[PDB]
Each structure stands twice: as C-alpha cells, then as structure tokens.
C-alpha cells in the first residue's frame, strides 16, 4: 500500500450521527434517555434548573433582589414523572386540581425534544393501519 | 315517482348545488326514471362540473357531489410524481427551513407556544351575617 | 427629456434621506447619463416652443412635463441657497414607502 | 356569524338561525335533512335560561310566557352559544 | 414581469434572484441561467428570435428601468468615447460647437434606430483613429 | 365569513384536485365543507369503507393537509369509546404547500442545471456510472476508449445530451400550471391567518347527520396539566 504506515496514538469513542452512517455506508477491511428526559423540559428542551423539579418555571425570583421576579425562557408546563415501562417511557402528570394523566412518550416526541436541547411498518403507515395497529 | 327528478344536465347541477350537506346522491336511484345518466354523468366529469365516485370492478358511476372547486385535471402526471416524492421535514423545523429560504412561514414552532384567621372572636352572631363579600 | 426623467426615477429608490447641493446633483447626472448644465437650463424654453409648434390643443397629457421642465431649469440656474432633499418616507406612518424629492430655497433674499 | 350556528334540538342535530328581517323576529331550527323544522316567535319568550359557564354542558332554554312553552337547544361551541 | 423568461423563476420562490442584461441584445436573464449557460464559454442568447452570440464577462446590472434608455445611454457613452470635444476646442465659436453637438446627436440617433448602420459605424471607426 | 377563509380554501382545493387523485378531493372537500368531522360520519358521507378511507387519510396526514384529534366520549347508553375527528390546520397546510412547491421547482431547476453539464460515461456490463473526471484516469495505453476498472470493457457514452430542451419545457409547463398557487400564496402572506384548533373549528360546524353517534363537543378535563405534542396553537 502507498499510504504511510503509522501507529494508533488515540482512540476517540463516540456516536454515529444519522448523516455519517448514510455517508459512510457504501485484504478488504469490510464495508458498512430516561435520565435526560427528567433533566430537560418535555415541551421546550430547556434545563429545568433536576428530577425533583416538576415545572418549567417560566418566571424565577431574581437573585439580586427578592420579591422581584425575572422572566426566563420557559413554557410553564408541569413536567411528568417519567417511568420506564418495558422498553417505552411512560410519563405521568400530576393535575393541579384524581389519577395522574398517563400517556406513552413516543420516540418521535423525545427525538424532537432532544433536538431542541441547547462534535463527537412502512407499508402499514402508508395506507390505513389504525393507530392501534401502528 | 323518481327519488330525484333529473332528466337534464342542468337539473342535476342545480339539485347538487342545493344540498345542505356533503351527502352525495346515489346513482342507483338517479338512474331510475332517467333513461341515460352515465352518458350525461361522464360528459359532466369531462367538463369538471361534478365529482363522481366510480366502482373498482368496472368503471360505473356511484354517489356524486357538486364540484365547488376548479378543473378536475390541471396537473400532468410528470409533476404529480414529483409532488409525491417530496418529503416534508419535521414540523417543529419546517418553519425554520422556510425562513432560511426567504419564504415567509405561516406557522410557528410548538416549542415557542408559551402555554403556561381561623379564630372567630364573636360567635353569638353566628348564622346571622350574610356574606356581602362584593357590594 | 426622457433620460432625465429616468435618472430622477432611479434617485427615488434611496433607502435613507439624502441631502445634496445642486452642483453635486449635476455632477452625478453628468456621470450616469451625459446631460450638461447648459442644456438643462433651456429645458423649459425648448419644451414651450415644441408644445406651441406641435398643435397640442388638448394638453392633458403634457401637463406632467411642466414639473420636470421646472425642476430642470431650477437646479441648473442656482447653486447657493438651494438644497435638494430626497426622502424615502414622505409620510413616516405608512405601510409602503412613498419616495419624494424636494427642491427647497433656503435664502428668502433671492426672490 | 352571530345569526346562525349549529344546535341540537330533541336529540336531532340541526342549524339554528335567528330571522330579524321579518317582524316579529323569530328563531328557526332546521334539521340536517330538512325533515324536522321548528320556528318560534321571540315575542312569546318570558325568560332566557342559560347554563352556568362552570358546567361542561352548553344547553340553552327559552321559556314562553303564560305549561309554558319551552324550547331548549344544546350547542357545540361556547363561542357560538 | 418579475421572473426570468427562460427558467421562469419567480421572485416569490427565489428572493435572491438577481437579473442581468447584456449590451449586445439587452435581454433580461437571471444569474442562475447565466452561469449554467455561459460558464463554459460563449453561446447564443437563450431567447426566441435572438441569435447574437454573447459572453458572460460582458453581462452587467441594468441601471435604468427603461430598456430603450438603457440602450441609448450606452450608445451615447460609446459615441462620446470618440467624439469628445469642448467649447475651448473651437476657440469660443458657439455656432461651430452647437453644430458639432448636433452632428453627434444625429450619429447617436442613427446608431440607436439603425437608419444607416453601415455608414455610421465606418464614420466612428474613421474618426476613432484620427 | 371572511375573505381569508375563502382564499385559503381555494388554495387547498386547487392543490388536492391537481396534485392528488380523485378520492382525496372527496375526503378533503367534505372536511372543508364541514368543521371537524368524525371518522364514522366521514365514511357515511362518502359511502366508502375503512379500508378505502384509511389510505386517503394517511397520505393527507403525511402532507399535513388534515389534522387528527382523539378524545374520549361518555355516552349514557354505551360504554366509553374513543372517537377520531379530522379537520384542517391552515397554517400547517399552507406551510407544507409552500415548502413542496419550492422543492419541486428547485428539483427541476437542479435537474436542468445538472443536464446542461457534460454527461458522465457508464459501463454496460456492470452498470457503474463514471463522471468525466473519473473516466479520464481510466485511459489505456493506446488511448482509444475508457476501460472499466472492474470489467476492463470499453465505456459507452451516456444519454441526456438531447434532453437539454425538454427540461426547459417541463419547467415552463409547471410554472404555468402552478401559477394559481403562487398567486394565492402572495395574498395569504399579505394578511395574517389565525391557527385553528378542534375547539375553534367547531365554531363553523354543519352537522352531517341528524343523530350522529359522535358528540361534536370539546369537554377538556378539569385542571389536567397533561400536554400532548401539537395539541395547542398560538
Ligand atoms: Zn419548558
Ligand atoms: Zn433564469
Ligand atoms: Zn438576446
Ligand atoms: Zn464495468
């Protein structure tokens, strides 16, 4: 081979972004969640401050002067008590005013939220396939 | 006694325009009392005057509706295929992408939607005082 | 006359208030187009002769040219005490800008 | 949009409209298919009973001035009601 | 009106669209069309009825909103690049200078309207060297 | 009601009748003629089965021309059931139409630009295309034809050298047929449109049937802090 012979000095572990997998995908060498959800808001993706906090706190008291609220980037949506049921994340909400509201946190919803955080089946849904089938 | 008196294309158009809902009038009863209706119904479809739901076993007219829109056929298949090929981005990001291209987006990101004493002194008057809280 | 009108049109597209003296306006006019000062002074006289000779009994269409001719003979005759103001907002409170060009006489002792 | 809307009368859904051009003004309810039609002159109404805004129901009743005649309609949207 | 007649790129769907013209024929065209057509080299104008070859390097931005005035001014600039005199050139003879200006105007008029294209251009060439 | 509603509906009608099949016109016109419409009521109006209505709804939901709203209903006679309603969110549909129109026009523009470029040679045996730059390094000693690296077979010049004019006609055809969409969008941008919701859409309801099982009312739960994705609008 004409390429220079070198010795591996570092090994940078990481993750594959969706773009890299598609781009990378074509002697031969061969050719080719719960913790975070409780820390960020499930509607805006901003850090609540975190598990104990169950509200986005759109307005927070000013540090310099008490009894003087300062507006912070938020949506004031009460956070769910996220629990891991099987392989899905089920969020339970505590209504202010009596069972808690329960719904399945779809991976699409979590993917959207994680993308808002501030380097390293097709046939069925295409036609018909009621929500139960999907 | 025909269910719907129709023996002319003009009569069919006015009857369909008078419907208060979108319940299409069946062709089974329309064909009754009308010697020919498919010939007129097909002619109107070519003129884009009405909408016809046709059977799949063989092309046969069924429940029809008034065409309140424009021409039924205006875009060539060469463009229909391209329209189907285009895949929309995620809704939360579509408005941002439209703004990047200089097109005013008629929507907003849902993430931006900001959807956010006991001791009584006198008791001998108990049961007498009405609560005139407001005026 | 035609290209003088066009130059006045392309000066109405400014995005900020412009205040210039007649000499500066003439210099830029002679740069973009090739209109000199002397012909610009005789614009009013020449137009009057042309109109009188053209049998224009109905002069509804040519009324607008009077304003252009008046502008031409004014900015080329005087240079001191006169200023040219171009604004993109004649009325600041408007959805769409309405450019206007003002030729103002500052010295009341000239007339 | 303050003279017409959807309403439910006697379990039958229909369109409720108020006619004011013809004197006296009257309230008319027409079924979707037109089989059932009922119009009441407003001059006979004594009181206008409306359910409180704190209740999930959107019902509205008109009581006739004197077994007084009662015409009760249920709406679908509070804004229209 | 506001779209490239060739590719019909509306300004609404392309706010970055910028049109350009060529002195040879003065036909409006968007920058995208210019690159995809003339980047390789000279080619005939992409218009129906126009067969005059042109180069990408000669394209410019239209100054005036009137095409005819755009053409007349360019011809005037070309003519004044050769026929350029002043009052001092005739030693204050206003009659001669006015006559000279009138001749230049006629030359510009003929070139713009093509009354006598062959003879007029030869006069420009003859005086250009002299 | 308002001029804004009429123009928006016309744009939706034009897009469906041109860029979609026939049954799609029936489905969307039914939910445009009416307000939020239950799935059962929609089936009765068009006299089509679930297997036929499903494909239409799914394709229209993908393009965001129709929105879905699921809520629980409590009828005294029968046990609680879940009802599905379909309506139109004008801001979503209009944004989708604008994006698709731009993408379709851009794709044709890109294809026209690509076509004007020199063609890239292709190998017949292995059907592996090669660009001009890539083929230049495949020259043989005699320098007669490009030889495929894998097959070692002469390369054949690719087509599309004659299509330089066809694509221009296609773009011309589209812009002429798509003119109404652009004209309608310009007026929409001038004005400002409010975002619709299941409750808001109910303000213009024309009941399809007399005794529809679906109770067309919005009774949100009391003090329910739960929020679903895309459940509210500005
Ligand atoms: Zn938040
Ligand atoms: Zn172009
Ligand atoms: Zn040309
Ligand atoms: Zn090969």
UniProtKB/Swiss-Prot annotation, chain A:
Residues that, per the record, bind Zn(2+) 1: 28, 31
Highest rank taxon of the organism: Eukaryota
Binding site for Zn(2+) 2: 41, 44, 56, 75
Known role: DNA-dependent RNA polymerase catalyzes the transcription of DNA into RNA using the four ribonucleoside triphosphates as substrates. Largest and catalytic component of RNA polymerase II which synthesizes mRNA precursors and many functional non-coding RNAs. Forms the polymerase active center together with the second largest subunit. Pol II is the central component of the basal RNA polymerase II transcription machinery. During a transcription cycle, Pol II, general transcription factors and the Mediator complex assemble as the preinitiation complex (PIC) at the promoter.
Domain notes: The C-terminal domain (CTD) serves as a platform for assembly of factors that regulate transcription initiation, elongation, termination and mRNA processing.
Official protein name in the record: DNA-directed RNA polymerase II subunit RPB1
Curated annotation (Swiss-Prot), chain B:
Disulfide bonds: none
Location relative to the cell: Nucleus
Superkingdom as given in the UniProt entry: Eukaryota
Family: Belongs to the TFIIE beta subunit family.
Note: Present with 1150 molecules/cell in log phase SD medium.
Subunit structure: TFIIE is a tetramer of two alpha (TFA1) and two beta (TFA2) subunits.
Known function: Recruits TFIIH to the initiation complex and stimulates the RNA polymerase II C-terminal domain kinase and DNA-dependent ATPase activities of TFIIH. Both TFIIH and TFIIE are required for promoter clearance by RNA polymerase.
Protein name: Transcription initiation factor IIE subunit beta
Gene name of the encoded protein: TFA2
Portion of the full-length sequence here: 181 to 327 of 328
UniProtKB/Swiss-Prot annotation, chain C:
Gene ablation phenotype (knockout): Essential, it cannot be deleted.
Location within or outside the cell: Nucleus
The protein's role, per its UniProt record: ATP-dependent 5'-3' DNA helicase. Component of the general transcription and DNA repair factor IIH (TFIIH) core complex, which is involved in general and transcription-coupled nucleotide excision repair (NER) of damaged DNA and, when complexed to TFIIK, in RNA transcription by RNA polymerase II. In NER, TFIIH acts by opening DNA around the lesion to allow the excision of the damaged oligonucleotide and its replacement by a new DNA fragment. The ATP-dependent helicase activity of XPD/RAD3 is required for DNA opening. In transcription, TFIIH has an essential role in transcription initiation.
Subunit structure, as described in the record: Component of the 7-subunit TFIIH core complex composed of XPB/SSL2, XPD/RAD3, SSL1, TFB1, TFB2, TFB4 and TFB5, which is active in NER. The core complex associates with the 3-subunit CTD-kinase module TFIIK composed of CCL1, KIN28 and TFB3 to form the 10-subunit holoenzyme (holo-TFIIH) active in transcription. An additionnal subunit, TFB6, plays a role in the dissociation of the SSL2 helicase from TFIIH after transcription initiation.
Note: Present with 14400 molecules/cell in log phase SD medium.
Similarity remark: Belongs to the helicase family. RAD3/XPD subfamily.
Organism of this sequence: Saccharomyces cerevisiae (strain ATCC 204508 / S288c)
Swiss-Prot record, chain F:
Zinc finger (C4-type): 123-151
HTH TFE/IIEalpha-type domain boundaries: 8-98
Location in or out of the cell: Nucleus
Domain of life: Eukaryota
Oligomer and partners: TFIIE is a tetramer of two alpha (TFA1) and two beta (TFA2) subunits.
Summary of the function given for this chain in its UniProt record: Recruits TFIIH to the initiation complex and stimulates the RNA polymerase II C-terminal domain kinase and DNA-dependent ATPase activities of TFIIH. Both TFIIH and TFIIE are required for promoter clearance by RNA polymerase.
Family: Belongs to the TFIIE alpha subunit family.
Note: Present with 35900 molecules/cell in log phase SD medium.
This protein's name: Transcription initiation factor IIE subunit alpha
Taxonomic source organism: Saccharomyces cerevisiae (strain ATCC 204508 / S288c) (Baker's yeast)
Coverage span on the entire protein: 2 to 235 of 482
